[PDB]
């Protein structure tokens, strides 16, 4: 049943007749987190992410798609040094028009208590008017409140 759904996805990757292959990967990834909420070796997540990126790599039509960004962000969280992934996306122009990119990037710096670089990431996202801008600005404001709270 788990077995059956995984097999169905694997066959869909092969036989998909549409023009948006990211859809198959995106549904396969989200079924996988729906069904393995705290991960596990049986989830196959990290290998699924690697396979998804490998299949869609260099597909620039997707560089601004949030499902694409998602694959990379999920992959990055499973890397020894998530900053390598953020900088990569940044160099390649993947996700650079999305607020979520800057939010997650800024969050990684905030988690290490590198508040100054977290702030700079927000500032760049905002200058680029990354979307949605109001969500990005709201998120920035609350990042600032968290820092203030930690310095009283």
């Amino acid at each position: 049943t788990g077995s059956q759904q995984k097999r169905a996805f694997e066959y869909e990757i092969r036989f998909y007749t549409g023009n948006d292959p990211l859809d198959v990967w995106d549904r396969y990834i989200s079924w996988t987190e729906q069904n393995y909420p705290q991960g596990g070796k049986e989830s196959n997540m990290s290998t699924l992410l690697e396979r998804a990126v490998e299949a869609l790599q260099g597909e620039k039509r997707y560089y601004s798609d949030p499902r694409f960004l998602n694959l990379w962000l999920k992959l990055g969280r499973l890397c020894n040094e998530p900053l390598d992934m953020y900088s990569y996306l940044h160099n390649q122009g993947i996700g650079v028009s999305l607020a979520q990119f800057y939010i997650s990037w800024a969050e990684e710096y905030e988690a290490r208590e590198n508040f100054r670089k977290a702030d700079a990431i927000f500032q760049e996202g905002i200058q680029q008017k990354a979307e949605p801008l109001e969500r990005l600005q709201s998120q920035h404001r609350q990042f600032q409140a968290r820092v203030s709270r930690q310095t009283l």
């Binding site: 690697e50 992959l75 499973l78 890397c79 020894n80 390598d84 990569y88």
Partner: peptide
């Protein structure tokens, strides 16, 4: 510990290898 985590730079290298 590194153990099970992905090596990002290695991954990117692997993609280029074909």
């Amino acid at each position: 510990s590194s153990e099970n985590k992905i090596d990002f730079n290695d991954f990117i290298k692997r993609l280029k290898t074909g």
